[PDB]
Every structure is written in structure tokens, then in C-alpha cells.
Amino acid sequence: RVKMHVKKGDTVLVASGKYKGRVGKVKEVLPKKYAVIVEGVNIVKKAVRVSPKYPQGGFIEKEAPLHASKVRPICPACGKPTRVRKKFLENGKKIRVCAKCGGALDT
RNA sequence: AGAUGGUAAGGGCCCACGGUGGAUGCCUCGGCACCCGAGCCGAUGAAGGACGUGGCUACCUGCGAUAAGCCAGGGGGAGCCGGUAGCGGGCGUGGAUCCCUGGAUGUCCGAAUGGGGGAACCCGGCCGGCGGGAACGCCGGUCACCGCGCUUUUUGCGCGGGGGGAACCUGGGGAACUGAAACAUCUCAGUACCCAGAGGAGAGGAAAGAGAAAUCGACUCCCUGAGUAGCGGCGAGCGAAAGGGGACCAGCCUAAACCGUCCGGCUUGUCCGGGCGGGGUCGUGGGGCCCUCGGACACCGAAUCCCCAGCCUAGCCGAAGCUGUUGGGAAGCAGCGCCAGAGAGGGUGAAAGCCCCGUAGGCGAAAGGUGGGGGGAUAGGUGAGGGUACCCGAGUACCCCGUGGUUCGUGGAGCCAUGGGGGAAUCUGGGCGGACCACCGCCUAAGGCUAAGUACUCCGGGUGACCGAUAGCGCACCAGUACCGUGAGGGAAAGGUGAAAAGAACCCCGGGAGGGGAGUGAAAUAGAGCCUGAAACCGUGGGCUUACAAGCAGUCACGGCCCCGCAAGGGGUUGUGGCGUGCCUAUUGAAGCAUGAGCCGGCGACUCACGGUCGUGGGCGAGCUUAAGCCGUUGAGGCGGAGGCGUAGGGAAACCGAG
RNA sequence: GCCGACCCGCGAGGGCGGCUGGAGGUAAGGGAAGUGCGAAUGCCGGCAUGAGUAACGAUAAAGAGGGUGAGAAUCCCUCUCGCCGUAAGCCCAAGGGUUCCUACGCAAUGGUCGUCAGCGUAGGGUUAGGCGGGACCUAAGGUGAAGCCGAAAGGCGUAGCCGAAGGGCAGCCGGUUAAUAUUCCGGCCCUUCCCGCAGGUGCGAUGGGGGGACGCUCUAGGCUAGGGGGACCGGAGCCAUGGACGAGCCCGGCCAGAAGCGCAGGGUGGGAGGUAGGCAAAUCCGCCUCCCAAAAGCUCUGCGUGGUGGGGAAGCCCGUACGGGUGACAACCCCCCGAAGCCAGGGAGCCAAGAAAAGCCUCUAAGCACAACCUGCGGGAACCCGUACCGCAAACCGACACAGGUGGGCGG
């Protein structure tokens, strides 16, 4: 209950510490623990030579987690938080003046 | 022959490097206190457990043959199938999780309720259904006893009944320690606990009162009155009400008189009893009955009837920022800027009003729940007089006896309450004004109901000159768990990798265990019950010293050895010698062959409330100050003279009065 | 937190700097207190000391070989000795809960060990018409409509009901898995309830009686459980070292079983009449009179036997395991010994005077009389809880593989 952040599954840059100012994609909200997984923390893992799936060379990964509350919106600009207008019918959380919500697909 | 430094099995002393071990500091899904809101759960089967329940599943948690969930209503917008990772396979913008509501399933146990019983298992009567289904078996209904009201007694129909409860509340039972420095009488106390029951309150409740004034006007609550007045082996000590100021304000239903009516009987009779109805309610007393004035269109009108706003059971929008920069990390630092009905705070690799949640501000109910805030209705209430002589609460007042409560322990003992015995009256009847009598007042007994103001915290929300893992709830955590006892009962330990799992692939010795590199990142001296790592504590290396040596173990001086220091100084050490009866408690007095302590860490003891009392810091000054409460605030104060202290004392008292 | 030989304070402290560490800290001026520990045979915690010493559970005992494996005194295969043998062997309930069995495993748990194991891990295993128990009965006892009483809470408590290893009540032999087997398999024996066929009866009660049915001691005859000897039965072997093929040594030489057959014993006298007991309902028993008999019948049991299913050893072979074979066409006979057990309610004696209720036998009420009931044969149905594993001990009561204790049966 009340798990609402403001990080949509879309595309959004990073105003962080490590990968400050970094371009990241759909981010994949995971989950309620308040974390992201965009295209930032690309680390290698220390798994074993798991004879089938991790063949004879176990020492690899892909995209590693990272916290949510560090990434920020995008439109005809960059960041600038999203603001919601009730559109009478549906929703419209365009960007700080410079428009476009995010849900898209005839939104 | 003579002379004199020197070896260390091992010991001590120092520094350094470690190990056990946990202290500390700091953090905090816990707890704490109070304020405020809230306040009933059950036979429609509860509080509370048991067996289960998931595809792989011990616990938890949630739930129940429909078992981590079922259908509809609202919400809401991107994730979802729980903590607990994985296998595995689904969920959705033909809008899933989840929060709010209504109901569905709700096996077995607990008032347990067909019967039995050692709670959770074993039998059964009737009504019906499933198997070929009568023999065996399953399933839905129903089946205990209490009260009370109708039924033709009959069989029945019916509303209700039990168990629970954090604390408070009423009533029935009701100690002891302890105090009186003894101990009965008195205390503690009518307290603890036992029992009964009622409820958000309880209880209480309209005067047979108060109390002395032709004075007031249910009940509970606070303060004041007041440690006053009395009670008392006049000791312990216990300790009233009235008045005042405030909080809250509310008043009522019946019986008897008379009238009717249906029932019962009976010595039919202008009737003894009864069901129901009309009737009537009092303090200049009212009411009955007949007559007298005219009694009315109105006048009031809820505690009950209903409707709605407000209130909750989820949520929703929501003001303002960047570029460089040291650092693994910025919110830090610099430059320029913005918001504010919002500079509360939390987190975000650190310290942010403008990154994320959120604050101020504004909004929200299809279904449930709540509602005098206010509108409507409804039950019911409204008069002046005369006669009459009817009623006005009975085994009661009243008397006595044995007594409980009251300030009253037997007092001169009232009053209230009443266990035994006697034993009334109906407004010239009657209780009380503290023996009792006169009087004069006061109040109308022996039928019942009444909100609010007060109390209490299982519960939720807010706050803090409240604790930070020995403190705190016993429990921060898988705690009413382990384990201890048959038993009632007792009651532990136990937090913290990092910002993030990135929680260590590969080689190497090794059965493994555990290590040596790699590799991880800021940090691996953060390496997995791992932050920070005191001491006792046992090791390791090294610097000084000790194998002719008598000791509360050190102190002063002198000596050498080693390490520092530019000098002069200094540290570490101990060869010699001068000296030298451990610490505490208690004692006239002890090192004590008097007591207490193995060693280190953490806990651990003169407080507080009211009154009193000497001063002392101020303000006022023959004046000083308010308690309860009310208003305001969101750490904002302010009204509020009721009272207490003071202006005069003397005497037991009347009273006198600077005497 | 660690360190210090600097500075300041009379001191308690404070500053200082170095190292360590990683996000909190709070002056001057005031204020608030659970505030300053060395002791309390003080509370919790941790680590020494004795001391590498006491002890390492019965003095019944241990020796080798081979394997296993990183490792064997301590696990496993063999040989060797020794200690029990009214036990320390074998059951039974009680109790405890997975210890059992199989595969893998040793960090802890066994007073060392550890390749073992009651320890760890997953997997397996616990069958019932008949054994025990419940839809049967009661005991002493508890509860408990009614009755009574008590301030209450509660006490006694008739009927009723629960309540036992006591009653009664239907299953015995051998096989078989890794483990349960009176459960499953097979040879057989019988019980339960429904439907029908056939015969027969007045049926039929929770109500009446009969019965069950009972004490201690001595003890009867017969039978067996168990036990011994045999020239004889069957067989795989064996002559040693001085003798010997002797009736030589060694092995075993059965179990269950309906009808029927034989042996013993227990229960009981048949018939008639009347009855104002059984809290009348009676033909039933009690009872008063008669006839007959005392054998014997009737009857329940116990034994032996029986058609038949089943068993079967020493030795040796392989097999580590468990055992698979061997094991034979197997032998399965005779003389003796003799139960405390069986025939049960047997005989005798004694004084202490020796349960109750249902099954069952039985009489009728109410009522039914198509029914119901009894028998017989057939054909259908017969459930719910138990069993693994330890049980004179290491799994049970004693905090522990304690030398303690724990009722009964076999016990050569």
C-alpha cells in the first residue's frame, strides 16, 4: 500500500553519483523495495562453471540492479519532474511545461 | 697460585605484533509516558486454538473441503504469483496486485448445545440425498438445559438465555503483615484477593433533603471549605457534611380513590379475588366523586419516529535548479536563480525548502458504519371554585433488642440502614431538625425509570529538556519461544556485511576443515552472527635484568645497558644500598591467624509528590496571590478573587478589646 | 577507541598532536537530572587459577589376520580366548515417539577415537469381519433431570450416563519383503448383518426369574505343554596320536487339523396337581402333595486321532551382506520322565464366609398376527482407532549409553 514512486517504465536519464548524467532505457521497476535496473550498473558476476547454462567459463553478468530515487524524467529537454492534470477523462502527466505524458499509445 | 666482568632451563619488567573476548560510541521494523479520539465480541456459534491448506514447503503469516484464497461495489494505473532465494509457470491498459466495503465457502475443538469423553475423537433418533445400494458407508437439515409470553391440557409457536472482557463500575463475602516502637480495643481497610453481574461507561439520581436564614432546591465531577468540626487505651492517628466558586443541567413512568369491562369462584350477592382498560401524582398538598366558571379553536411537543450535512472504514491533486567542482560518493564548496497557505521530516552512496516520498492547502464515498448539528412527525402536557368525605405505598413507619454506615470506638446518641420479637394511621395522617417534652419550621416515606458533566485504557492517532540491545515491555529478533516442575507456575539468551550481493568464478596444499593468490569494490584491517574492537585474557618477536638468593614487591639515591634528543634534557631497565606492618568494613584499638572480594567490563543506591520549615533570590506592599474552570495557542499566553496568608490580641467559654 | 617524555589547572579535568575509525557532534550563557563504584559470601557477562594434575562408569578380557579407506586398537569378513546362561537369553503390556530400515556423511553428539552409530540427510516402512478397542456389560468411582441444602462461587445427590488387564465374546498352522505380518499370501475354522428359498415356532421387552457365580488351604483320575534315553530311523562328513569300524562320534527324528472315530470330565433327576410370592402380566422359577429313577439318558467341554496344507537339521558349496543353495524322494519311530497348564462351576477340609451386569436359558405384557421369530441351505453385505522401533533396558522413572529401579508370561 502506498508504493507509488514517480519512476515509470520508459526511458530516463541518471542524476546520480557513479553514473551521473547517464542515458538509461526502460529501467524495469523492481519492485516495491524502491529500485531500478536501467542500463547503468553493468557488472560481471562470479558464478561457477555450471556445466549446462554457465559452461566452462563462469565469470559473467549483464545488468545489475540499483536504487530508484536517483533517476529523473525526459521530454523535449531532459529531467524536469512530471506534473499530472486530470484531463477530465483520463490522465496526463506531461513534463514540467514541455509536454508529453509517458503512458503513450493514444494517451 | 693470586684478580675479577660473565652462561638463561626458564622467570620478571617494557615496547611492538596478534588471539580470545566482548565493553564503548553511534545507529534503530522495539518499547515508554501522557493528551486526545474510540469502546463492546457471541447461539447468524465469539474471545481462543486444532487438523489442515501451496505443484516442489518446517515455521511464519493469511486462509479453510471453494483452503496464501470466491462473486459483486468503490478505488487505482503498471506492475503482479507473501516474508524466503530457487525450480516452475502465470497476471494483466477486454485494465491484474493492493486498500476500503457487502456477502460466499467457513471441516474439527471452545458457552459447545443430540449422546459420550481424557478439547479436538468415538457413537446415535428422526427428515431427505450418493453408491447395484436394503445389509456397509458419506453428505445437507434437525435433536441439550434456563427464563419468559401465547397455544386445547395436548404437540407445540415464539422473543430471549449461557461464554468473553486491558482497566474502570455496583452489589455480596472479606484477612494478615504493619502501625500504635509491646499487644487485643483502633490501624493498615472495608484495602488485597474470592464471588456475582451490568456497560461504554458503570453506579447514582428529584428530596419523608438540606439547614436556621420566612435560606436553598435531582444525581454524579473538580476545586475550596479542611486536616476544619468531631471520632479516639484523647495514643496510634482516622477524619465529615453545609456554605462558595465552577462542570454538566431533566425530568419522569405507576399503585390506591372512582368508572368501565372480560375471567374465577362462591355461603347470587347492589360481592371476595383477578386479566385489561380509563383514571390520577403532591408542598400555598395533591388527586377521587357530584355540583359551580365556559371550556376551548389553540399552546407546548420529546429521552421516541425519520431525513439530511458533518464523522470514520481506502485514497487524490499538490509551489521552487541548474552548470562547474574536490571526493568511490555530494545535499558539501563556488557561481547565478527560484518557491512559499508549504524552512515538518524522512530518506537519497554525506549535511537538500526546489532529487524521491511528503508538509501547508484543497478534495474525496457506489457499499458499510455514525449522527439531535438542525428540519418535519409522533407519545404526551395547559385552568379558577364549593361541598363531600374516598385514597395517598404494612408485617412498613413506630417500640425494643442485638447492630452495620456517619466525624461519632456507646457517648447525653441522634439520623440513616435492619436481623429477632411486638405492632399503626391516611393531611389534626405522618419522618427530621442529635436524650427526651413543648413549640416553630422542614419534608410527604415504606413502587419503578433518567442523558450529560466523572472514571478506565485491550484499541487508534498525535507529543516528548523518554531508553537506545544489561537500558528499554519479560520479549527490537520466529517470545509468553527454548528450557525448568507432575502440577498451579516459573521465566532465557538472542540487533546492525556494504551505498549496492558485487556476498569471492579459476589455480594451488588439504579427506575436508581452512587457507595462499586471483577477483569484488572507496575500503575484504567491511569476508559472511562480518562496523566501530576497552580490559582481563592466553601467545610471538625483540630491548633491559636475574642461577650466594630473605620479599605489601615499591619508594629515594647511585651505578651500568639499550633507545631517543642539536645541546642541556629525556625514556625504557634494574645491580646496589637508605627506608618501608596490603585495600575495605568494624573496632578503644588490626598487617591481621577478625570480615568482604580470582581477575577485567557493564548495572547498582539519598529521589520525588504534598504539606511544613529556616533562609535566600526577586515583584508588590497593608496589603499579597488566585484553585478548579473558561478562552486562546499548536511549546502563545490570557481571563478567571472562590479561597488561603496578612492588618489584634487576651481568656476554657460568654465576652472584653490594645487591652 | 589506541599512544604520549608537550602545554595549562592545587586537583578532578581540559587543550595538543600522532595513529584508529567512519556521520555524528554542540561552545560561551543558562537550565533538566536514573550523574562520577572497589568492595555489598552484590546482578549479568567473559577468561584464568588448580592442572596437562582427578577422573575417562563395574576387573567378564581380550589376541591376530584380511578388507575398507586420507586415516583404523575403537567399522566390517574369519579364526582364538574368555563371561553370562531364573540371564546379561526370549516375550508382554507400560512408557517414548521415527530411535527402525536403505543409500550417502562425520563439524558437533558417544567421557579419546571414528571410515561405526540410537547422530545428519532425503527415501522407505506401520494393513485386520476374528489379536486389543469402539458403535456390549457393569465394579469401587465421577458426572448428574429430579430432591434437598448453602451469601455466591458450590455440597450431598435418585433415575440416567462415561468409566477394567474383571465379564463375555467369533483364528489356528506355515510362507513371504530391505524392513510390518494371528493383519498380506496359502491350507483350513468360525462369527456378523441383509435378501431369498425350504421347514418349523404363537412370536416378542430395556419388565420377572434362571444363569453368569466367584473364599483360603490340601487334592483326585485321566491328557498334554515341556524333558530325557534308544541297539533303531534318515544323512553330509569323520578313524586321527597308542587302540577301535564298536550299539563309534555328529545331525536332526515333526506342526497344525472341521465331520466322524476312541479317552477323560464337568453341568442336570424326568412327570402331575394346585398357588391370595416373585412389589401378579404370566404356563417361568419359588413353593405345598403324588408317581417314577437313583442307573442312565440328555448335554458343554478337555484329550488323542483324522482327510489335507505345511514344515525338515549337522555338514559342505558359493556368498563379505541378508543368506542363496546344500536339503535329503529326507528320517519324521520306540522305552521312560511328567506340569504350577487342560477337563471348571471336580473331590476334601477350614473359618475369616468369600463382587455386580450383560451374552445366554427363559415367562409373558404392550402389541403383531401378509407380520414377527427359531432352524436350515443358498446368495449378498462385515465398518471407525491400534500394530513400525526399544521394553528387566542406552529409546522406560532417575538432568548422562548413571552399576540404581520397573508388575506378568517361557525360562533348557
**Strand B within 7 A of A46 CB:** yes
Q: Which nucleotides of B are covered by protein (CB under 7 A)?
A: 77-80, 93, 95, 98-99, 314-319, 321-323, 327-330, 347-349, 355-358, 499-506, 519-522
d(C-alpha A12, C-alpha A7), whole Å: 9
**Strand B within 7 A of A25 CB:** no
Burial profile A61-92: b = 16 or more Cβ within 10 angstroms, e = fewer: eeeeebebebbbbbbeeeeeebeeeeeeeeeb
Distance A96 CA to C341 C1' (A): 108
- Cα distances (Å, whole numbers) of residue A85 to A2, A59, A79, A92: 20, 48, 18, 5
**Strand B within 7 A of A15 CB:** yes
**Strand B within 7 A of A42 CB:** no
d(C-alpha A26, C-alpha A12), whole Å: 8
d(C-alpha A11, C-alpha A28), whole Å: 10
PDB resolution in Å:
4.0
The answer to whether the beta carbons of residues A94 and A83 sit under 8 Å apart is: yes
Grid coordinates belonging to A35 = 529500485
Method for this entry: X-ray
